[PDB]
Amino acid sequence: SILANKDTRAVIIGGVAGVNAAKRMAQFDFLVNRPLTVQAFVYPPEAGQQKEIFRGGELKNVTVYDSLAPALEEHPDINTALIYLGASRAAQAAKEALESPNIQLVSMITEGVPEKDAKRLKKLAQKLGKMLNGPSSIGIMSAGECRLGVIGGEFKNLKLCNLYRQGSFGVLTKSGGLSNEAMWLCAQNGDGITSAVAIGGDAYPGTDFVTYLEMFEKDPATKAVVMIGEVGGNLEEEAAEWLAAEPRRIKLIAAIGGTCQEVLKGAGSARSKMNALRDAGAYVPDTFGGLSKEIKKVYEELIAAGEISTEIDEAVLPELPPRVQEVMKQGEVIVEPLIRTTISDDRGEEPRYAGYAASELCSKGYGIEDVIGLLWNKKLPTREESEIIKRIVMISADHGPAVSGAFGSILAACAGIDMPQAVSAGMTMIGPRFGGAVTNAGKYFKMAVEDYPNDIPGFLSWMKKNVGPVPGIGHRVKSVKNPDQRVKYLVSYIKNETSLHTPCLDYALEVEKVTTAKKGNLILNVDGTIGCILMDLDFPVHSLNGFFVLARTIGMIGHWIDQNNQNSRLIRLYDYLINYAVKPEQEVPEK
Template identity: 40%
Template sequence: KIKFSIMIGEVGGKSEYKVIEAIKNKLITKPIIGWCIGTVSDYFGGSIQFGHAGAKADKASESAVQKNKAMKQAGIFVPNGFNQLPYLVKELYESLTDNTVGNSSQDINIIDLPLDCETLVKTNKARKKTHFVCTISNDTKEEITYCNMPITEIVEKKYTVTDIIGLLWFKQKFPVWASNFIDLIIKLTADHGPAVSGAHNTRVTARAGKDLTASIASGILTIGPRFGGAIDAAAKYFKMAYENKMEPEDFVEYMKNVEKIPIPGIGHRIKSTKNPDKRVSLLKNYVFNKFPTCKLINYALDVEKVTTSKKENLILNVDGAIGVSLVDMFWALNYKNKDIDNLIQRGAFNAFFVIGRTIGLIGHYLDEKRLNMPLYRHPVDDILYDEESPI
């Protein structure tokens, strides 16, 4: 509730007199502290105009001294000087809240403000709302931990890079056979020469003067269904066919007539049955010798027999071999089918290609910078200009 008001006026004008009239007519009943600034003007000769537009007393009644006198006569609390104003405010407030004056302090609603969030957090009475949840690492302890394992322990136990991938991607340390298989994937996918889209983009971007991050990003962004991104899709469709007990011939027909897409992980532009991909051979050799079970890769090779009977380059390519082998790996690690499906859906299988190929893309970037190659412009004789071609 408002107990009193403070009014600050100035020389010139009649606003203060309107307040005086309102008090006389009982339109204002609560106490007012008033002061009209400009009392010093009486010490100057003539009419003095202050900085504020119109702040000038043209009549005696408009001077600060006369206004203060009139306000005091009307019952407004007027200090003897401007410096007394804060003391008068304190005095009036205390008198209005004093029971002996008839204005009980009970009329004042004292609100107990709640403690602010920072204080509550410091006193362990509240927890600040978080915007992120991290379950793989913690940098708030004495030393950083990966899945609750201190970094010094990781170094002391000689964890490999692929062991770290297991911790940070899947929250577990894989057995040696699985960890070494991931290492093999990274080695086999690290590079595939300068002609593929990822390396090409990286080199062109590097020649344009861009930095490492931009150049690598331009290469990584080409990864997709037609370049390295078929690992997830191959795992998805081969796993689906195996679980539904489709015969290899039926699976081939299903992909052609129902999904109406080429089988992900099947086919290569250069490699064929007569010119096999050494990377696939290395993968198969490792899986057959080290994996506890090889169910899906065997099924994929049965499908390959059907596809290569139609065309010799419709082989199980490196993406397909990695995809089906990863499913076999997670089966052997006792992952449930729904958990494997979630990994595939989230792109976790393609992530192995991304991390492997990034090594090569960095190599291509550094190669361009090392050679100090000029800005790239595609040869005109390699472009067919055909403006007359219909839309």
């Protein structure tokens, strides 16, 4: 291996691109069974946050820092920086990394870095005696040791290219895509790679081919180097110069792109480079396809010369753990559900309410009242139930702004609160005293019908002693002298326009005659009326308060809209309306 090894600890300077690289490096880390390469992230937009990175099946939380100084202070361990920032910020981040005494290697993936900036960074790295890779480098890959960047692709590719252990071939490319192809060629026709370095495709790379060839010459594991160049610059001619200069231990296999001298001194031509390298003693194929044959040639030669051992890959390799959903689909894991739903299924193209497609209900002419029945009773209502639900909702929709629920919404609308939150404050008011006696009215009147059929005074005595005021009886403004036409209407409709037998309602109407004899305001109210009608329709007991909650939401949204249209100011209750029955003012005693 040459630049990245099991001692390489990185800081990734960049955002989402940086996090995706880190995730790829974590998969390599898992494969070669090493601790996580990424120690920290440096990204001011996400400073303070933590990134969830899986090393196999184990979640690792990696901290995001505002700058490099706190990152290195918390992780003195870091010796490498990977720059995943855009062109406008990359060079400054690379400068900061090179000037950090801990950082020995800086690699840039950034494309579009000004040549002037790359030149300045190369000179700075030389002064400080540090290594600069890129810009425009996909990464550095040391088989069985370290992965810097996304180089090597998917986990299946790491296994196919035998990147879990050192081979005998070094890889040097300008091109990112071709470094992965060369790694594969070395695995397919040789014994795999030692290190693969993408130097970048920019005019002025941080480190050239000879710099890396010198390092490969000193690596005992590297016996040959596959160098993939292109027309432009003199980096490959300098490599041919390096190879010719002295007898070298490593063999050089080279492919030069750009023999398109037929498409519309030229020292940097592909044909000149190929001749320079061929003359210097490099293995240069006619096409990129011949490169597999050159690798097989060198491999067979090194086996013959006893430099490579034919020891087959008898290693038990880790496999990436699947996501819980995959294993579940196959039924290979048990997941105890957090919740159980019986009323709707959203998993298809559209929701199914109690088995019925929502749009199919619309098409066939069903209404809101039919959807209420499906979601609350799991049964499509009969035309009769449907007609009753419709009237209960319409009659209960609103009862002016003075009532707790409506007033709660108005208070919140004037406090400048958004609609769903303001209506939730009004809905909180629905309880034993305002609108939320529907369920209890149903329960107690059903119990009266069963336990006190011909004994209203017994029922009333029992209620006074055990529950207090009768749910569904009483009103603040309505009375015998000021009747509630809402209850007269519903009773009138249920008796005169339906075939429904209502024993709960009949009982409740009789207790109203007794209670209004005690106090005139002890009328059967809308809660009691709806409670009894619904109990008599045999609706689930739990659902009963639903009819008020839903109907009064129409009014509460109405009031919120109204105050907003008016541009109402904040309400602060007038002083003359408060009785300040407060303690006399007093001095606070000394502690």
